[PDB]
Amino acid sequence: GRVRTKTVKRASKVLIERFYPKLTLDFETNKRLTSEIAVIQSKRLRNKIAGYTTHLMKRIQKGPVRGI
Amino acid sequence: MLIPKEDRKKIHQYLFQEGVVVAKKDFNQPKHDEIDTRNLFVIKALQSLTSKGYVKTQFSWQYYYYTLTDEGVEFLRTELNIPEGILPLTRLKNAPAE
Amino acid sequence: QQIHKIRITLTSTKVKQLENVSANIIRNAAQYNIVKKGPVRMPTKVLKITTRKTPNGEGSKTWDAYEMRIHKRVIDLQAPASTVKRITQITIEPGVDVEVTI
Amino acid sequence: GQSDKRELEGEVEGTEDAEAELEAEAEENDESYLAELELSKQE
Amino acid sequence: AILSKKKKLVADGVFYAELNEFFTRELAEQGYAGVEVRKTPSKLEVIVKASNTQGVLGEQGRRIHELTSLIVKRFKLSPEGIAIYAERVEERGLSAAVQAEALKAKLLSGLPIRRAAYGVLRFAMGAGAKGVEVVISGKLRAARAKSQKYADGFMIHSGQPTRDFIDIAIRHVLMRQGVLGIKVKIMKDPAANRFGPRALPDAVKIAEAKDEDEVIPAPTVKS
RNA sequence: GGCACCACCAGGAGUGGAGCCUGCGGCUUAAUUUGACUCAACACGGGGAAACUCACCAGGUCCAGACACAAUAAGGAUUGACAGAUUGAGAGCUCUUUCUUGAUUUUGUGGGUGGUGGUGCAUGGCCGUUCUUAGUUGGUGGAGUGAUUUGUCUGCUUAAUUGCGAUAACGAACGAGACCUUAACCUACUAAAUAGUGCUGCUAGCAUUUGCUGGUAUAGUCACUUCUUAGAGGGACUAUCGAUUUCAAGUCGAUGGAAGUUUGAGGCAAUAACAGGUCUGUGAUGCCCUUAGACGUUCUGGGCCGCACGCGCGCUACACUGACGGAGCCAGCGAGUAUAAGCCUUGGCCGAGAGGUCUGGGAAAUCUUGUGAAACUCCGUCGUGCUGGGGAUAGAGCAUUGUAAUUGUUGCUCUUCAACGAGGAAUUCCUAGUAAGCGCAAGUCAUCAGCUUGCGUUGAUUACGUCCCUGCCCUUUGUACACACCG
Ligand SMILES: [Mg+2]
Ligand SMILES: [Mg+2]
Ligand SMILES: [Mg+2]
Ligand SMILES: [Mg+2]
Ligand SMILES: [Mg+2]
Ligand SMILES: [Mg+2]
Ligand SMILES: [Mg+2]
Ligand SMILES: [Mg+2]
Ligand SMILES: [Mg+2]
Ligand SMILES: [Mg+2]
Ligand SMILES: [Mg+2]
Ligand SMILES: [Mg+2]
Ligand SMILES: [Mg+2]
Ligand SMILES: [Mg+2]
Ligand SMILES: [Mg+2]
Ligand SMILES: [Mg+2]
Ligand SMILES: [Mg+2]
Ligand SMILES: [Mg+2]
Ligand SMILES: [Mg+2]
Ligand SMILES: [Mg+2]
Ligand SMILES: [Mg+2]
Ligand SMILES: [Mg+2]
Ligand SMILES: [Mg+2]
Ligand SMILES: [Mg+2]
Ligand SMILES: [Mg+2]
Ligand SMILES: [Mg+2]
Ligand SMILES: [Mg+2]
Ligand SMILES: [Mg+2]
Ligand SMILES: [Mg+2]
Ligand SMILES: [Mg+2]
Ligand SMILES: [Mg+2]
Ligand SMILES: [Mg+2]
Ligand SMILES: [Mg+2]
Ligand SMILES: [Mg+2]
Ligand SMILES: [Mg+2]
């Protein structure tokens, strides 16, 4: 399965509450932004965090999300 | 142990002047490469010395590490009938480094 | 006995110090106008030893698989013999050993 | 230490051992004829 | 003589393994931590880390002089080809080897386990360790043997970081009734690591909001 | 309730049936040393034992019994010994025999020391198992006098206590996940005479059209990094789009992609626990036993292989989707030495073979080596026949290793050519480069691999579901158990 964990779910939603204006609906742009916003120890976690942040961003435009 | 007096002697002037001796644990070795006598003689001769509190013995990886006590320098001072100029070599106060 | 085609062979277990020494020599061979060939990455050798986990012979048959990677690099220099040896002392590292062959 | 005591006096006695040693150890750091010749002189 | 590359790097490791245990047996009473073999041209530098660098360098450095001679005579080295230095460990509390040897010297003095165990729990934490757990197993007056764990603070257990931020030391303690086995696991703080990673893999540090400025309609500031 | 090919469904290959290899029990034995007995004992102790190993058996040596004493002792305490007897022995072991050495040493006391001797139910460490299942814990707050409890849950979802969500809980930690190693992509960087290529020198063969195949090339003092190697990076995050869903976590389809099953595979792996296994791994150990006619250690010979039998891991096969006979001819993981005590060994020459011999290369991306491996493919012989399937058992002979091959180490040659004609009740493993074949290398190793650990060649059938069997986890429940049903 592809269930994201809590270390990526809670860390991604902190970004939205903190850097929503600079975020976007594009993963490639979001991936570069989070490398200068957060100190991520591994490249794999950086893409994972941005990939779920993109999903949340894509979901915010359709209505209000819980936890943000 | 039955060691000839002369072979026991060479064992004593190696444990003095370089007051440490290393011997591999093989009893039938013809030559300990540093005391021209049987290797077994070296082990048993120094087993008596560590038995009478003149050398510390340490064993690690099938090897004997013999070191001469300060009390043992005095024993070879008299028994060997040597001049009272002491300090074999590891006691020559070469002093450490910082 | 002047300028020669000189080989320096670098072997070590860890790559970070190996590439620092390798890069440091290349750096010193750049500001000094010495033509160089390398570094050449030799195929790394994986020394593998597979033992049984159990000191005894009881339990599930489980095995350890230990490894010892050896990385080897050779660099070719065109310089007099006095120059290359002093470069080695500039880039001396405990992990990496150096052998020089003409 | 299978008692309500001697572990009470194991921590307070144990911890005062370290407190005395960190300060002692942090003070320890802040204030930081031959022989073979006699065998050849037989000439 | 002529030794292959595969067989030469292994020999250096085997030489290190045998030399390291030699110090553990000889300098056990001086809190031996570890040894570093710094090869260099025309010399073989050996750096030993111990809690007490006086027992090794005692009576005008007689023991260290008489100890380097035991290595020249066993490895057929030239008398000038090796040099031994004794260096004090900077943070004695962060070395599990020093803490385990220290515990053994207390357990062998008849001190109670609870007082002895808490003496390393607080000494490790006082030095700044992120976590520490001590397990002592064996027999004490009772015929049946038991083990007791003494944890404190934060400890990680699985994955690579245990190889990076945790050092461990096990020693056997010779008692009148049997053997006591002690394990001292110390986790150092990753922020102080100077060679490897400086944080745990899942530690995410989000920057702060730089916003909440006031925007003015449309001027131009010339220079 | 839930999960799981060490459970099942659909299936694949089988095992159990035969011969043989090997392990276990038993029997036997001079000894056939020993541990382990469901999973988690039985090709396991890296245990493939000729000697050694070795712990067993029948015999024979040595002290390698330190040290304080006491005795003895230079008018010699003691050690070595030719020759003959004795002995398996050219063991002065011992006996006749007198020579030699000289306070090292002989006897008693204590004290040692050494034990593959006993105790893994006295212990450390290590390892296996519960279990790699998903579980464990504290702060504040709520409940309770308390031990405790909630948090840690109806439901959905996930490989997962992993998430959504419901919520007297809120916010967290370990474990999981993250992490690390490896495999798959990069005509985008960095270079490579120990890697490869095109050109270019020089050069061969075939048709002459200037073409097609080569050799050579460590001075052509060339060009390049795609193939090869490896360091710095990039790249996948379920990306985009459709469906379902509490429109949530997610799941299933397409498209793009090297990769869309956690991308494939592993390494590590929580809180406790077991009288699980090892004192036969340790100069790791407590205690007991033994310690000179040794239970130490060594030498010789045998045994660990011994054979009316039961059991387990396997290898060959029962044929034609095949055997042979020629011919075609492709990998990857790896290893390799010196004055040794002898490594990998091409190439040449002998030999039917096995094997022998002379040189040379390689401490290695250089040489063995493109390890020209086997299945496999083509063309033939065979023709349903215990046959040219199968190759036990055995006779005679030839080489290798080793001090030593007898109870055949192994290999080779001729001959004999057995059960077996697809295997009862039962039962194992397995979902994609997987299973199954098929070999090769590394470990053990003087010799011996039907064994393991890996690697690659050819390469599928059938689910992608469930709790019916089996095992485990959770919730509720009962309890006279808590040394916890071995109660
Ligand atoms: Mg973790
Ligand atoms: Mg993990
Ligand atoms: Mg079945
Ligand atoms: Mg079935
Ligand atoms: Mg079969
Ligand atoms: Mg034997
Ligand atoms: Mg024997
Ligand atoms: Mg036997
Ligand atoms: Mg024995
Ligand atoms: Mg145990
Ligand atoms: Mg609470
Ligand atoms: Mg409370
Ligand atoms: Mg959890
Ligand atoms: Mg964690
Ligand atoms: Mg060339
Ligand atoms: Mg050409
Ligand atoms: Mg994985
Ligand atoms: Mg047990
Ligand atoms: Mg038991
Ligand atoms: Mg033992
Ligand atoms: Mg033992
Ligand atoms: Mg062993
Ligand atoms: Mg005997
Ligand atoms: Mg056997
Ligand atoms: Mg037999
Ligand atoms: Mg098996
Ligand atoms: Mg054929
Ligand atoms: Mg090759
Ligand atoms: Mg035959
Ligand atoms: Mg026939
Ligand atoms: Mg079953
Ligand atoms: Mg054999
Ligand atoms: Mg082999
Ligand atoms: Mg085996
Ligand atoms: Mg109850």
DSSP E209: P
B48 touches strand F (CB under 7 A): yes
**What SS3 string covers C9-62?**
EEEECCHHHHHHHHHHHHHHHHHCCCCEEEEEECCCEEEEEEEECCCCCCCCCC
* Cβ atoms of residues E198 and E190 within 8 Å: yes
Packed helices C81-90 and C15-31: angle between N→C axes, nearest 10 degrees: 130
Which of B1, B86, B97 minimizes the C-alpha distance to B49?
B1
Tokens in use for C16?
A: 């970070």
Q: How far apart are CA A52 and CA A6, in angstroms?
A: 11
Rounded Cα distance between B59 and B25, Å, is: 10
Which three-class secondary structure state does DSSP give residue C84?
helix
Supply φ then ψ for residue E10, to 5 degrees.
-65, -40
Please check whether residue E62 is in contact with residue E132, taking contact to mean a CB–CB distance below 8 angstroms: no
Q: Do you know the residue count of chain E?
A: 223
Q: What number of other Cβ atoms are within 10 A of residue E134's Cβ?
A: 26
Q: What does DSSP assign to residue E214?
A: P
**Chain position carrying tokens 């000839």:** B4
Method of determination is X-ray
Please say whether the dihedral angle defined by the alpha carbons of residues B12, B18, B22 and B28, taken in this order, is positive or negative: negative
Residues listed for chain D: 43
For residue D33, what is the DSSP state?
A: -
Cα separation, E181 vs D25, in Å, equals 27
Rounded Cα distance between E9 and E15, Å, is 10
Q: Give CA–CA dist E56/E26, Å, rounded.
A: 10
b/e string for A2-40 if b means 16 or more Cβ within 10 A?
eeeeeebeebbbbbbebbeeebeeebeebbebbeebbeb
CA distance C75 to C41: 10
CB atoms < 10 A from the CB of E195, how many? 7
A24 CB contact with strand F at below 7 Å: no
User: Which of E21, E32, E70 should we substitute to test contact with B (largest number of B Cβ atoms within 10 Å)?
Assistant: E70
Taking residue E94's Cβ as centre, other Cβ atoms within 10 Å add up to 23
Q: At a CB cut-off of 8 Å and minimum separation 6, what does A55 contact?
A: none
Q: Which residue has 């931020």 as its token pair?
A: E165
Collect contacts of E42-45 with beta carbons under 8 A, ≥24 apart.
Answer: E42/E80, E42/E81, E43/E80, E43/E81, E43/E82, E43/E83, E44/E77, E44/E81, E44/E82, E44/E83, E45/E83, E45/E85
Asked whether A56 and A68 are in contact (CB, 8 A), the reply is yes
Are E206 and A18 spatial neighbours (Cβ–Cβ below 8 Å)? yes
| Residue B14 three-state SS | coil
Residues of D with Cβ-Cβ distance to E119 under 8 angstroms? 14, 17-18
SS3 C67: strand
Compute the C-alpha angle B38/B43/B44, nearest 5°.
95
Would you tell me how many other CB atoms lie within 10 Å of the CB of residue B46? Answer: 22
C60 CA vs F2 C1’ separation (Å): 28
As a whole number of angstroms, the distance between CA E137 and CA E146 comes to 6
Query: E24: helix, coil or strand?
Result: helix
- The Cα C9–Cα C41 span in angstroms is 11
Give the integer Cα–Cα distance in Å for C80 and B80. 58
Q: How far apart are CA E167 and CA E95, in angstroms?
A: 8
Q: Do D34 and B83 touch (CB under 8 A)?
A: no
CA geometry: angle B10, B14, B15, nearest 5 deg: 115
Residue bearing tokens 């040597």:
B82
What 3-state class would DSSP assign to C65?
A: strand
| C-alpha–C-alpha distance, residues E85 and E15, integer Å | 18
B56/F111 CA-to-C1' distance in Å: 20
D27 to chain E, any CB pair closer than 8 A? The answer is no
Contact assessment for residue E124 and residue E171, using Cβ atoms and an 8 Å cutoff: no
Assigned token pair, E166: 């945790």
Read off φ and ψ for residue E149, nearest 5 degrees. -105, 140
Give the integer Cα–Cα distance in Å for E51 and B76.
34
Query: Parallel, antiparallel, or unpaired: how do β-strands C3-12 and C63-80 relate?
Result: antiparallel
B50 CA → F350 C1’, Å = 66
Q: Any alpha helices (H) in chain E, and if so which ranges?
A: 5-26, 62-72, 96-107, 113-126, 161-165
CA atoms within 13 A on the CB side of E93: 24
Q: Return phi, psi of residue D8, to 5°.
A: -60, -55
Q: In angstroms, rounded to a whole number, what is the distance separating the alpha carbons of residues A49 and A45?
A: 6
How far does the centroid of ligand 24 lie from the alpha carbon of residue C53, in Å?
22
Spatial distance between the Cα atoms of E212 and C86, rounded to a whole number of angstroms: 59
Contact at CB, E37 and C72, closer than 8 angstroms: no
Measure, in angstroms, how far nucleotide F346 C1' is from residue E4 CA. 21
Select from B7, B91, B8, B97 the least CA-distant residue to B49: B8
Nearest alpha-carbon partner for C25 in C88, C74, C81, C70: C88
With an 8 Å Cβ cutoff, is D1 touching chain E?
yes
Do the chains D and C touch each other, judged by at least 3 C-beta pairs below 8 angstroms?
no
The experimental resolution of this structure, in angstroms, equals: 3.0
Can you count the helices (H) and strands (E) in chain B? 3, 3
Nucleotides of F under 7 A from a protein CB: 35-36, 40-41, 44-47, 63-68, 78-79, 101-106, 122-129, 157-160, 162-165, 172-182, 191-194, 219, 228-232, 234-240, 248-251, 261-263, 267-273, 275-278, 281, 283-287, 333-339, 363-365, 452-454
Determine whether the interchain pair D34/B16 forms a contact, defined as Cβ–Cβ distance below 8 Å: no
Closest CA to E19 of E48, E41, E40, E39: E48
Residue E56 in contact with residue B85, Cβ under 8 Å? no
Q: Which distant-in-sequence residues (6+ apart) come within 8 Å of A67 by Cβ?
A: A13
Helices E96-107 and E113-126, packing angle to 10 deg: 160
Two structure tokens written together for E197: 């990673």
CA C49 to chain centroid: 22
C75: helix, coil or strand? Answer: strand
Rounded distance between C-alpha atoms, residue A31 and residue A13, angstroms? 15
Assign residue E100 a region (left: φ > 0; alpha: ψ between -120 and 50; beta: otherwise): alpha
The dihedral of CA C10, C15, C19, C25: what is its sign?
Answer: negative
Taking CA atoms, C97 is separated from C73, C100, E40, E51, in Å, by 11, 10, 9, 31
Distance CA E135, CA E184 (A): 7
